[PDB]
Structure 1
Amino acid sequence: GTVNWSVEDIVKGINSNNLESQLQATQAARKLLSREKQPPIDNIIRAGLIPKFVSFLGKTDCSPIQFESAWALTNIASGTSEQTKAVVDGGAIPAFISLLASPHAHISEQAVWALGNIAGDGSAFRDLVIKHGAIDPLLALLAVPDLSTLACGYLRNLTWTLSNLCRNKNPAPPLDAVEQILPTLVRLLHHNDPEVLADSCWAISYLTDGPNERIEMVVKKGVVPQLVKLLGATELPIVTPALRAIGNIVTGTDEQTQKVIDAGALAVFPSLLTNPKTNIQKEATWTMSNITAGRQDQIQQVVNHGLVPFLVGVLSKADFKTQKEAAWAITNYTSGGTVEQIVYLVHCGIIEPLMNLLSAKDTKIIQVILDAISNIFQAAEKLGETEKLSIMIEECGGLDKIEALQRHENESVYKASLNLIEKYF
């Protein structure tokens, strides 16, 4: 009945003086905008339909046209920035916010969805949705004794929209909006649905992606232990954002990093550092590098949890981007570690795989590795064992690489190479 109309028929119906004709034409628009292959968004916009849809959102008297127009506008708003802008320019934001209070669950849900697409465009529209007062009525929809009594699709859409209100930087969301949302987020983070859990974790990852003051707001809410629990989940879509959030937190202060250690995160790293998904290995190693950039007592926890052999493992064999994060983890470890911690590193076999990485055609990892060698030498000096170390590097082909690097395009590379050579070889 409302299948495969032309835009001109849609326009004719919507321009009729007849609410039922308008409803049928709006549903036909919804079906057009709902098809997988190239929905004619720009055609619908060019026909001048957005203002009509927006006015239909206000017809409390005709809940079906509210729904159909909400869905049509949702799909227009899901398009390019310019398409989302056309929806916002039509006055849709306050109209959708009014629909959050609808007695019809399917209509409020659609308003939630539409607002998520709008906010999802970027920080300006995100902040404009917030200024129009979206947060209170959204949070009210989740103010129930037990989340499990809500429809699953409904709760998933709400969680997703809230996560978009937490998303993007330049600038990050308003501090007071974040404080307003966080308690609900913490509660969703304890829900049992994997998709709600995944999107909640993503939201927490966005909020921890910034300066220490932002990390602190989250850490203060006591969520780190739950994040560490989620870090051990079987579902990759949960582990990925849980690990991103943990990684973000350890870019903060040593005290913030310690909360992650206290929560038990390190015991999960044997698995993460050998995870068959390369993204996970890379991000786990990145996280380790910011832990080895901390205090000597924190480095010692890395040692105690048996994680140095896992770092040697990743340095020995991994996707190259992971190997680069491992090199960083090693340079950090050697920069900040005691002599005894640094010795331990050598005994775990760090030298050969470090040397093997010197043949990389990546200038930055070479600098990083050379720096590690210097720090390791520095430690052997304090023990008067620099000759034993020189032989080791000599015996595994390390010297051939360092000597050959003396004649290298980069300046500080050739500098460090020649320095190492003359100072120790």
Structure 2
Amino acid sequence: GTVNWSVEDIVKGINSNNLESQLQATQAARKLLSREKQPPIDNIIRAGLIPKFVSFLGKTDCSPIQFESAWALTNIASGTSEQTKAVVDGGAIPAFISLLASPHAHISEQAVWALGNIAGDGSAFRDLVIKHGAIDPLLALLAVPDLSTLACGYLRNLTWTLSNLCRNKNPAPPLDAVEQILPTLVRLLHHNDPEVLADSCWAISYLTDGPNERIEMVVKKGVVPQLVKLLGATELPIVTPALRAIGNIVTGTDEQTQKVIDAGALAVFPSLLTNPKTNIQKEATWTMSNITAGRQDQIQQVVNHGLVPFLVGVLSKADFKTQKEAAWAITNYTSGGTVEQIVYLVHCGIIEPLMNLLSAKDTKIIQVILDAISNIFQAAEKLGETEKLSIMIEECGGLDKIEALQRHENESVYKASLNLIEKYFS
């Protein structure tokens, strides 16, 4: 019936003076734009159909053409930035916001998904959607005593859209909008559906990706324990953003980091630091690098939870990018830790994997490792054990790497390598 029409025939129907013919042609267009192999979006746009679709959004009298045009538009709006812009310039944002309160669930849901793709395209459109007033009617869609009474796909859609209103930076979303959305987000964060939980976590990871002030806004709603719980989930799509969110939070103050530790997060890290998914291992190690950059009492908790051996593990063998994160975790630990904490670290075997990484063709990790070696010597000085440390390093072939670093291209490494040779290796 409306299957494989040409653009020319769609234009003919949409331009006819017959609502039924227009509906028929709009559905044809929706099916065209839904096809999997290269949907002819730009031809639809060139034909001038977006303004017509938009006007159809306002036909309260004919709910089927509201739905088909909403769907056609949503297909276009999920495309490139240029294609999304074409939809916005057609006046679609307020028309979609009007449709949020539609008595038809299918139409309301279509409006939710359209606004999510528009807002998700970038900071400016996100903020434009907020300015047109989308948040109140979106939130009102979730105003029921129990989320479990809503349709599943409906809830997932609302959650996904809410997370796009939280999503980009330069600038981050308006403080007022974040505060308006955060309580609904906290509620969705305890909802038992894996996809809703994943998208709520993504939303929280966006909101915590910024200065300590924005971290505090989230942390003050009390979500850190639920985030830590989700950190232990079995679904990787949940774990990934829960870990991103935790990672962001420990870039904050000592107090904000302490909330993560108090919630029990460290006990999840033996499995995260040995996780089969490379990016989970890398983000867990980055997270550890920010915790070892904290207070000595926070370093001590890392020690107590048995995590130092796992850091030695990741330094010894991991994806290189992960090894780089572990190098940073070690330099931060040695820069801030007590003498006893540094001694313990050497007792766990850090020296040989640290020296082995001096072979890396990566200038910045070399400085990180050299600084770390210097920090450990500084601790050995206060105990008069610089010589025993020297021999350790010399036994595992560390000297060879260091006397070579001497020769190589970089500013600071040259300077750093000489100093160590001159001062601790006769």
TM-score (norm 1): 1.00
User: For the residues of structure 2 that align with 1:178 and 1:362, how far apart are their CA atoms?
Assistant: 40
| Secondary structure, counterpart of 2:109 in structure 1 | helix
How far off its partner does 1:111 sit? 0.1
How far off its partner does 1:152 sit? 0.4
How far off its partner does 1:301 sit? 0.3
User: For the residues of structure 2 that align with 1:223 and 1:303, how far apart are their CA atoms?
Assistant: 26
User: For the residues of structure 1 that align with 2:101 and 2:148, how far apart are their CA atoms?
Assistant: 20
| Secondary structure, counterpart of 2:382 in structure 1 | helix
User: For the residues of structure 2 that align with 1:156 and 1:263, how far apart are their CA atoms?
Assistant: 27
Encode CA deviations 1:310-359: one digit per residue, 9 max, x unaligned: 00000000000000000000000000000000000000000000000000
| Secondary structure, counterpart of 1:383 in structure 2 | coil
User: For the residues of structure 2 that align with 1:59 and 1:148, how far apart are their CA atoms?
Assistant: 32
User: For the residues of structure 2 that align with 1:315 and 1:82, how far apart are their CA atoms?
Assistant: 45
Encode CA deviations 1:77-105: one digit per residue, 9 max, x unaligned: 01111100000000000000000000000
User: For the residues of structure 1 that align with 2:269 and 2:12, how far apart are their CA atoms?
Assistant: 62
Kindly report which structure 2 residues correspond to 1:52-91, keeping only aligned pairs within 5 A, or say none.
Answer: 52-91=52-91
User: For the residues of structure 2 that align with 1:36 and 1:114, how far apart are their CA atoms?
Assistant: 19
User: For the residues of structure 2 that align with 1:149 and 1:2, how far apart are their CA atoms?
Assistant: 35
Encode CA deviations 1:134-183: one digit per residue, 9 max, x unaligned: 00000000011111100000100000000000000000000000000000
User: For the residues of structure 1 that align with 2:71 and 2:64, how far apart are their CA atoms?
Assistant: 11
| Secondary structure, counterpart of 1:29 in structure 2 | helix
| Secondary structure, counterpart of 1:361 in structure 2 | coil
How far off its partner does 1:407 sit? 1.0
How far off its partner does 1:249 sit? 0.2
User: For the residues of structure 1 that align with 2:397 and 2:382, how far apart are their CA atoms?
Assistant: 25
Encode CA deviations 1:6-45: one digit per residue, 9 max, x unaligned: 0010000000010000000000000000011110100000
User: For the residues of structure 1 that align with 2:69 and 2:16, how far apart are their CA atoms?
Assistant: 16
User: For the residues of structure 2 that align with 1:293 and 1:285, how far apart are their CA atoms?
Assistant: 12
Would you identify which runs of 4 or more consecutive aligned residues in structure 1 move more than 6 Å?
Answer: none
| Secondary structure, counterpart of 1:407 in structure 2 | coil
User: For the residues of structure 2 that align with 1:25 and 1:154, how far apart are their CA atoms?
Assistant: 27
User: For the residues of structure 2 that align with 1:143 and 1:122, how far apart are their CA atoms?
Assistant: 28
User: For the residues of structure 1 that align with 2:345 and 2:423, how far apart are their CA atoms?
Assistant: 22
User: For the residues of structure 2 that align with 1:76 and 1:401, how far apart are their CA atoms?
Assistant: 57
Stretches of structure 2 that go unaligned for 5 or more consecutive residues are none
| Secondary structure, counterpart of 2:210 in structure 1 | coil
Residue of structure 1 in register with 2:337 after alignment: 337
Encode CA deviations 1:352-393: one digit per residue, 9 max, x unaligned: 000000000000000000000000000000000000000000
TM-score (norm 2): 1.00
Kindly report which structure 2 residues correspond to 1:345-424, keeping only aligned pairs within 5 A, or say none.
Answer: 345-424=345-424
Aligned-pair Cα RMSD in Å = 0.3
Stretches of structure 1 that go unaligned for 5 or more consecutive residues are none
User: For the residues of structure 1 that align with 2:332 and 2:11, how far apart are their CA atoms?
Assistant: 65
How far off its partner does 1:408 sit? 1.2
User: For the residues of structure 1 that align with 2:165 and 2:33, how far apart are their CA atoms?
Assistant: 25
Residue of structure 2 in register with 1:156 after alignment: 156
**In percent, how many aligned pairs have the same letter?**
100
User: For the residues of structure 1 that align with 2:74 and 2:170, how far apart are their CA atoms?
Assistant: 25
Encode CA deviations 1:230-257: one digit per residue, 9 max, x unaligned: 0000000000000000000000000000
| Secondary structure, counterpart of 1:267 in structure 2 | helix
User: For the residues of structure 2 that align with 1:142 and 1:87, how far apart are their CA atoms?
Assistant: 26
How far off its partner does 1:293 sit? 0.3
Encode CA deviations 1:109-156: one digit per residue, 9 max, x unaligned: 000000000001100000000000000000000011111100000100
Residue of structure 2 in register with 1:177 after alignment: 177
User: For the residues of structure 1 that align with 2:32 and 2:416, how far apart are their CA atoms?
Assistant: 64
How far off its partner does 1:411 sit? 1.1
How far off its partner does 1:300 sit? 0.2
Aligned length in residues = 425
User: For the residues of structure 2 that align with 1:172 and 1:36, how far apart are their CA atoms?
Assistant: 34
User: For the residues of structure 2 that align with 1:304 and 1:138, how far apart are their CA atoms?
Assistant: 46
